[PDB]
Design a protein around this nucleic acid. Structure first.
Ligand SMILES: Nc1ncnc2c1ncn2[C@@H]1O[C@H](COP(=O)(O)OP(=O)(O)O)[C@@H](O)[C@H]1O
Ligand SMILES: [Zn+2]
Ligand SMILES: [Zn+2]
Ligand SMILES: [Zn+2]
Lengths: 45, 590
RNA sequence: CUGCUCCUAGCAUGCUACUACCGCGUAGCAUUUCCCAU
RNA sequence: AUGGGAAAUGCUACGCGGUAGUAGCAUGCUAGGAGCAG
């Protein structure tokens, strides 16, 4: 399931999540990362 | 349709897609912009798309000439060439593309969100044409934002003048005032026609709203009121005209032995004459609009037109001119809407007059000999070049004060803006100094000038009148809503109502409330001469009532309060909620 | 050739329990912002 | 001298449902190997 739109969107979501976790700016930003992760998992499912 | 570029101003005819205003770009400039930014759409004599219907690629990064049109790689004909040039973009004129590199600022202009003060300050630092384009795109951004405002899914209507308002969920339900423009749309499965130019302000008490439209039915349930946006027109004239020094007078007709207060300012008037223009930088209250009518008295012969930012200032100017200058040579141009009242004694929009007045947004496109503009702080750099384009005279006068509050600029929700960077003129005023300055607040007596010069201003200000002994204060807090519903301090209104009788000449004291809800409810309760600061800008009153509701970045603004107090003449009474702010001034407490 | 049984493997289904996340729904608690001209 | 106060960002608790992963139960079938009886 590598060459799939869900896979690519999840990869971008993970990239943004790790980037913003390294930034460590806001708790709401981290919640946004978690929500993006969760919809990425949802579609990847 | 061909024009010059912007960064390099070479003759070209390319435009960008993602850039909202779609400006003319040369080849190299456009290539740089599309390489840097994410703009992947270029406009020319035709749009740029993969001509093959089985493709929908609009990216300029790859596009292949399919004989006469553009193609993708999967549809590229064999004998065909990609149209991304050797570090440029292929098209109209390439042999006369002069080079210029200042694209990074231009990229940032088409990048930033105008929520950070860095955007606005950087905007007022670039090339003139870049400044005009930035102002234009900012105005367009504001129009787009206000377009996406509340869609009032109302349910009830009270009377022919009064109605009940309810809104949808998700979009910003805008405030209600005569300034805004709304219109309902009959959703009857069809005939979604405009019901008329509908203005709206909140009702007197409770869940009540007063409605007034160009037509006025008895509104139904299923309608909604959506805020539409007006278009923005491009401009060409410079914001600021160049300066030229002279030797003798520039052809103006004097009036010997007319007055006395302005014979001392005759030197200043001649200083204006010896140059193309001049400006005025001084504190409020001290010969600002008054240095104007006497200057007109110096040369009251040419056929002239003036204007002002807001309506109160121009109406006060009309009254002052009637007081000094003959009436039947001056006029005031009114707009078509005219929902906000004006000088309802003078000529009704008589453009054919010798000394004409008007508002900023309703100016004609005629010319004059001299001109003066009001409150550069309240204005942007866009309207400056707008009036430069529509109006072209031989002498220009500008007035303003950096301590005043600037234009709203609501999109800037972060940080404060330095007074010089309010517009180009304010930066020039703070960098090169004034052209002529007057510093002796004449309407307020010495106690007010002492308080303002000691606390916020520099200790340089002075007055001409001694203390009027009408200084009083109040500090107790009161309660507000605390959950949206901009603060309303009702206990203070009740205490004012109970007290006022003891104060004999304060029955007509000008009530002040910047907040619209408090502004309405105060007149609803008693009917004091209600007023807001914004609309007190450039006004003046014998008896004033100021009311602070609560503490907030708005109500704690130093400039707001100091511009509020510069309007005291003989008497005033005002209240706070803040301790150190209550202690800051040097008046009697009570 | 019929009937009975054992064992193994796989599949598939049903049901049960556990774990995670999600959003919803409800309840409680608590805060953060606070608005203006045409 | 009056029984007319929200937008909701944040915390906690409960439930639902979905999704995924884990363990368990029952079954339904298939296939294979083997043994007994007539
Ligand atoms: N030289 C002066 N002599 C008397 N009154 C003056 C003088 N200069 C200004 N004023 C008073 O100031 C009022 C107008 O305010 P102004 O000083 O023009 O500044 P602004 O209008 O921006 O506050 C006028 O009513 C006028 O009476
Ligand atoms: Zn662009
Ligand atoms: Zn160029
Ligand atoms: Zn294609």
């Amino acid at each position: 399931f590598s060459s799939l739109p869900s896979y690519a969107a999840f990869a971008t979501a993970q990239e943004a999540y790790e980037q913003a976790v390294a930034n460590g700016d806001s708790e709401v930003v981290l919640k946004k990362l978690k929500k993006s992760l969760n919809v990425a998992k949802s579609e990847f499912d | 349709a061909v024009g010059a570029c912007v960064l390099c101003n070479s003759q070209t005819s390319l435009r960008c897609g993602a850039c909202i205003r779609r400006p003319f770009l040369c080849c190299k400039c456009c290539y740089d912009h599309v390489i840097s930014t994410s703009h992947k759409l270029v406009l020319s004599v035709n749009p740029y798309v993969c001509n093959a219907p089985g493709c929908d690629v609009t990216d300029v990064t790859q596009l292949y000439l399919g004989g006469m049109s553009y193609y993708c790689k999967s549809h590229k004909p064999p004998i065909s060439f990609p149209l991304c040039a050797n570090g440029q973009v292929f098209g109209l004129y390439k042999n006369t593309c002069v080079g210029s590199d200042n694209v990074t600022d231009f990229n940032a202009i088409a990048t930033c969100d105008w929520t950070n003060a860095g955007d606005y300050i950087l905007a007022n630092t670039c090339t003139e044409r870049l400044k005009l384009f930035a102002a234009e795109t900012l105005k367009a951004t504001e129009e787009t934002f206000k377009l996406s405002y509340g869609i009032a899914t109302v349910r009830e209507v009270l009377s022919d003048r009064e109605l009940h308002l309810s809104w949808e969920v998700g979009k910003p339900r805008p405030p209600l005032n005569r300034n805004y423009v709304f219109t309902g749309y009959r959703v009857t499965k069809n005939s979604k026609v405009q019901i008329g130019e509908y203005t709206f302000e909140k009702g007197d008490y409770g869940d009540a709203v007063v409605y007034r439209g160009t037509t006025t039915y008895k509104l139904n349930v299923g309608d909604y009121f959506v805020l539409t946006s007006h278009t923005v027109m491009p401009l060409s004239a410079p914001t600021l005209v160049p300066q030229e020094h002279y030797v003798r007078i520039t052809g103006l007709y004097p009036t010997l032995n007319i007055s006395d207060e302005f014979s001392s300012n005759v030197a200043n008037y001649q200083k204006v004459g010896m140059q193309k223009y001049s400006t005025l930088q001084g504190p409020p209250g001290t010969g600002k609009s008054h240095f104007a009518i006497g200057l007109a008295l110096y040369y009251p012969s040419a056929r002239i037109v003036y204007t002002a930012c807001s309506h109160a200032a121009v109406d006060a100017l009309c009254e002052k001119a009637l007081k000094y200058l003959p009436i039947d040579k001056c006029s005031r141009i009114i707009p078509a809407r005219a929902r906000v009242e004006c000088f309802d004694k003078f000529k009704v929009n008589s453009t054919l007059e010798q000394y004409v007045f008007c508002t900023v947004n309703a100016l004609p496109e005629t010319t004059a000999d001299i001109v003066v503009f009001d409150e550069i702080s309240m204005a942007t750099n866009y309207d400056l070049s707008v009036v430069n384009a529509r109006l072209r005279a031989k002498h220009y006068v500008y007035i303003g004060d950096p301590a005043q509050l600037p234009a709203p600029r609501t999109l800037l929700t972060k940080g404060t803006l330095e007074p010089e960077y309010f517009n180009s003129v304010c930066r020039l005023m703070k960098t090169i100094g004034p052209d002529m300055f007057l510093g002796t607040c004449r309407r307020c007596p010495a106690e007010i000038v002492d308080t303002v010069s000691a606390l916020v201003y520099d200790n340089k200000l002075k007055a001409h009148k001694d203390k009027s002994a009408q200084c009083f204060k109040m500090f107790y807090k009161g309660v507000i809503t605390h959950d949206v519903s901009s603060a309303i301090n009702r206990p203070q209104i009740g205490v004012v109502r109970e007290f006022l009788t003891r104060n004999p000449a304060w029955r007509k004291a000008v009530f002040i409330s910047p907040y619209n809800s408090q502004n309405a409810v105060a007149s609803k309760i008693l009917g004091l001469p209600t007023q807001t600061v914004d609309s007190s800008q450039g006004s003046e009153y014998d008896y004033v009532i100021f009311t602070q509701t609560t503490e907030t970045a708005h109500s704690c603004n130093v400039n707001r309060f100091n511009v509020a107090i510069t309007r005291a003449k003989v008497g005033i009474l005002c209240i706070m909620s803040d301790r150190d702010l209550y202690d800051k001034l040097q008046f009697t407490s009570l």
